[PDB]
DNA sequence: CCGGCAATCGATGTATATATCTGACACGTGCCTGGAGACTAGGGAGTAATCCCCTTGGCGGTTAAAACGCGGGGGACAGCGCGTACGTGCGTTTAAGCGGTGCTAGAGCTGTCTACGACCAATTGAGCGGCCTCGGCACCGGGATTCTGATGGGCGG
DNA sequence: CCGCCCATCAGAATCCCGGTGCCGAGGCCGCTCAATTGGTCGTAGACAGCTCTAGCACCGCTTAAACGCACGTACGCGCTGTCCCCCGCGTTTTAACCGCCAAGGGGATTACTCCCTAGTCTCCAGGCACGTGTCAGATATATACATCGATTGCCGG
């Protein structure tokens, strides 16, 4: 089923929290829709190569070892998922 | 617009030729200008040999393009 | 009628929220959100949940990462608030086109 | 002694570590003091984190070690800060951290 | 299928440096993964260090010379004296 | 005097066939083989990391393939995917 | 030879060789040498054809290390390649922010 | 005659960014290198292509570092370039802690 | 020597980086970055060439250095 | 006789102490696959000798760049006023989260057999090193064109 | 009547054009070593089939979080004044660059040997999968303490 208008999902509160986390005290009014910018452009370039990775395969299924690897790739390891 | 075209002898030519034109036509305008038969012509762009079926736009060919003859790419 | 002063319930939430580990984004419009951008490579796909957990962990780190950027970033300009051209200004120094 | 970390007094193991450098495409052969001098290594850098992590996990009352104290054994100290520079551990945090310019007057 | 790792190494690591401390599942998957990483980072930089001066075989100095070339400042200093007092007991032995 | 081989004459090749009246100096050589060898080794290196993380011991056009699509952008890959598929097919073809 | 069967100018005997040689895995396949010299191939005459053009802008009949830096530097995609390298006697791009502009 | 403060200056910005060579002395570099490497091994020889490859290395890091201090000196609403603006630049980038 | 690089050049450095005004605590700073770069890089060049066992440092050893460091350089011999 | 400064006092939020139960960690058991032991064959690497190339050091000149100083204009910084945007709190609405149920597509393992890659030997041409020659580009001198800033003027509050 | 905005001049600065020459790029030639060809052999991988696990879909109920609104205050932004510190230009000093010469350290090559590593076969024990008990920690409840913002008293203007 195709679903549309996700991108509203990540609600104002939940980016005030990751602000506080990382040491904000005040946020202008414009700065969410800049937000979900980012972090969309960041997920479709994630998902992009962990596609790839899951497609070379033969695989119909996305693991968490084809994450790992695409992170790896785009220069962030990451610890606790295997590897 | 007007493409610069080069001969194995240096000269070159300037001609007034529109993106959407093919490149028989090109070579038609050609033979009018030169009297080079279009079978004897063989327009190159960006190394890649040009097709008489395909148009200008077709290649991508933009102002102030540069073609060269006789050279065959194989 | 109490009321605290504006900038007090910040500090709480930066101390509260800067000693804990826990996610801070809900889960179902994550897993919303990752599996409609899949849909643009390919369809008929299937996610393990570790997956999407992994994606949320690498996500929740980036953008707090940024943010932290920001904040700096802010307070150059002599001032409190985060800004649009903050965000901006640490992502083109980053490198991050 | 019998078994190669014995001979060289380790607890990593050397015919493991010689397993997987002979099989993972680097080199045609493989020396004989290679793996005892990567195992050595391996073991060292595992102490010294794991003796962070032990200190950090006692001074929250605590007896078991989590995610939580490897990350603030990790970000305390300079050269594993160095090491793991673009490193992200899972179920972490961050470093309490605020600027002076936000605390009130 | 049988899964293999570095749980139990690190497990007599952490009962000799805390004899009492334990660990939890999640912090034994993180270890492994650094462990891991480490591990190809030095095996991959002295295989470059081989290829560069035309040899066909890794030897304890492509070690020596890949740990001094990643680790920071003190912590080379200390792996490499750990590294080369193991060598000498296993050769002594 | 020892052999050394270089990408220089295949360079100049390809130059001739786009720009026929066209040079290129010493400095631009070194340039143009030093971004050969770094492709090649770049390419080579991600197919040799997608050929271990499958359990398998040999290298094909499909690591190849993989690997491009994984490290050039955008445009770039498509095209350079094209190139190679048709290299691919014409060498098959002849015999 | 195989570059004429392939129909290339790159050699298809050295690239097996250099692939066979460098310790990336036991065995290689008959089409890998091909597709990696096509690709390589393509590159080369991408940038070699945007330096030729920067070099005609010039008015000058040799590529030279500026005329290269300029070709990589305007392109997108090539920039995104060769993001985070140096290329000798290149220079820069020219470029000055609009603030520092005579009013 | 006499030019006001700011032309010169622009005249020099446009003749130094469409020029290629090198912007510093090769004798007062080749000195700092040789003590620099005298810091740590004694009794070494340098190759010249070995130093002019550290020369242009160490001049394209300086003038993408100065790319990057006029950004920030530009985000603060200043013309003039601080070495707080260094500081910001280094710190994002994370060559700075 | 890091008197030698003179306030001249690196108003020059500034000028091709595009800076108009400059103030006079800036030389001071520069000079301190060059140094802690050229430190690295060197470091790492003369362990590259002390493993060769050579006592001349190379062309190939600076441009190894700054591969790791993760700045390629082209038209030196890579 | 009021203001700013300083010392109280209630409300709220956070940390601390005490059972309580549970689910994850630590330990015990069987077995099978990978590591250790013994031996043989061969080539990779160490070692010594030679040669010449390049790196280091020194001397002389000349000249452009660096250093120093000065006068001044423009930019950095500080204070002040205003107004609106963002924080804090409250009442209402919504969907996330949990707990089950069922079902099916696919991931994972196993046996087989076959086409593909490695290995070997002989042959031969493509590519590398060396030499030559001329034309693209560096260099120098002169005129053309373009900003730039001072000067005169005009105009409106 | 005078300060502010606008049109117009000479003077440095950059570029283009024409002649000169000169060194590097492009072409030609000989040889040797790596790529091609043809055949053999072993095994890596493709393919088919079976099993069972986990991912997807749906339904019901609680409740915490999200959302919308009001109010007020503190921060952002714009303006004004000052003052000083960087910029542009002229004079003097210095050391960088070029050219030339000389000497020797060490990098690169080659010949030879030998010892360290790979490959083979046998045997056995350590590590992995599985099962089980119990205790470190999450949960719930009550309580004590610290902080924050309003209230009020006091020295002083």
Request: some cysteine.
């Amino acid at each position: 089923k195709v679903l549309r208008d996700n991108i509203q999902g990540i609600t104002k509160p939940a980016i005030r929290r990751l602000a506080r986390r990382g040491g904000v005290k005040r946020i202008s009014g414009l700065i969410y829709e800049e937000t979900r910018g980012v972090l969309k452009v960041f997920l479709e370039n994630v998902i992009r190569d962990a596609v790839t990775y899951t497609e070379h395969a033969k695989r119909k299924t996305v693991t968490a070892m084809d994450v790992v690897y695409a992170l790896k790739r785009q220069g962030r390891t990451l610890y606790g998922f295997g590897g | 617009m007007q493409i610069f075209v080069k001969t194995l002898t240096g000269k070159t030519i300037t001609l007034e030729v529109e993106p959407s034109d093919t490149i028989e036509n090109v070579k038609a305008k050609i033979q009018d200008k030169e009297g080079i038969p279009p079978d004897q012509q063989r327009l190159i762009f960006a190394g890649k040999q040009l097709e008489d079926g395909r148009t200008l736009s077709d290649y991508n060919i933009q102002k102030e393009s540069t073609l060269h003859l006789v050279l065959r790419l194989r | 009628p109490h009321r605290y002063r504006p900038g007090t319930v910040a500090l709480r939430e930066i101390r509260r929220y800067q000693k804990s580990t826990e996610l801070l984004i809900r889960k179902l419009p994550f897993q919303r959100l990752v599996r409609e951008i899949a849909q643009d490579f390919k369809t008929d796909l299937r996610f393990q949940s570790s997956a999407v957990m992994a994606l949320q962990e690498a996500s929740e780190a980036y953008l707090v990462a940024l943010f932290e950027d920001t904040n700096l970033a802010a307070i150059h300009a002599k001032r409190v608030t985060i800004m649009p051209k903050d965000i901006q200004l640490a992502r083109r120094i980053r490198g991050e086109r | 002694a019998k078994t190669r970390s014995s001979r060289a007094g380790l607890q990593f193991p050397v015919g493991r570590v010689h397993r997987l450098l002979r099989k993972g495409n680097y080199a045609e052969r493989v020396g004989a003091g290679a793996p005892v001098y990567l195992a050595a290594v391996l073991e060292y850098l595992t102490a010294e984190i794991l003796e962070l992590a032990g200190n950090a996990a006692r001074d929250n009352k605590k007896t078991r070690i989590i995610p939580r104290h490897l990350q603030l054994a990790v970000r305390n100290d300079e050269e594993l800060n160095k090491l793991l520079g673009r490193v992200t551990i899972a179920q972490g945090g961050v470093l309490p951290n605020i600027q002076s310019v936000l605390l009130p007057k | 299928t049988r899964k293999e790792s570095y749980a139990i190494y690190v497990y007599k690591v952490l009962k000799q440096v805390h004899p009492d401390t334990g660990i939890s599942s999640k912090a034994m998957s993180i270890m492994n993964s650094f462990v891991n990483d480490v591990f190809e980072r030095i095996a991959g930089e002295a295989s470059r260090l081989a290829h560069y001066n035309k040899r066909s075989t890794i030897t304890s100095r492509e070690i020596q010379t890949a740990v001094r070339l990643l680790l920071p400042g003190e912590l080379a200093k200390h792996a490499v004296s750990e590294g080369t007092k193991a060598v000498t007991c296993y050769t002594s032995a």
